[PDB]
Design a protein around this nucleic acid. Sequence first.
DNA 1: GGGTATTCGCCGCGTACCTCTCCTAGCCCGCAAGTATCCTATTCCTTGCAGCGGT
Length: 105
Amino acid sequence: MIKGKQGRFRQNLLGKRVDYSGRSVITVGPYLRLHQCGLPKKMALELFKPFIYGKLELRGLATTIKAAKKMVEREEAVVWDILDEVIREHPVLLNRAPTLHRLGI
DNA sequence: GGGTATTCGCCGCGTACCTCTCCTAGCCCGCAAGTATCCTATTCCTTGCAGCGGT
């Protein structure tokens, strides 16, 4: 339980799984500037959920976390503008599977 | 002893993800269910002993 790829050291101790993540297929979309990338609506609304809760409670549209979770769950039209508000200047990291050199992530 | 050759055994061999299936073997003892058998009655006949009129 220590040796080999299945051991702790190379499996659960040097590289872990991680929350706040997602995976998808990629297409081209050549209308983008060099410093931005597209992101599906659904992945965006699922990754950033805690920030959406924070903004909703700050704005007083849900006076608890359960009501806010409901509002996100059925996505009343308000949450989309909030989501755009959160994204304004929040970078994300894109990574590919066999990431050889420093430029892979 | 000692420098050398030959053999034996251990160590190692890419990353990330998706789909599916399967995961101990054998004995044993209580136990439910189903059954064949054994005791239980009825009808006929021929005895063995106790009451009982009769004198």
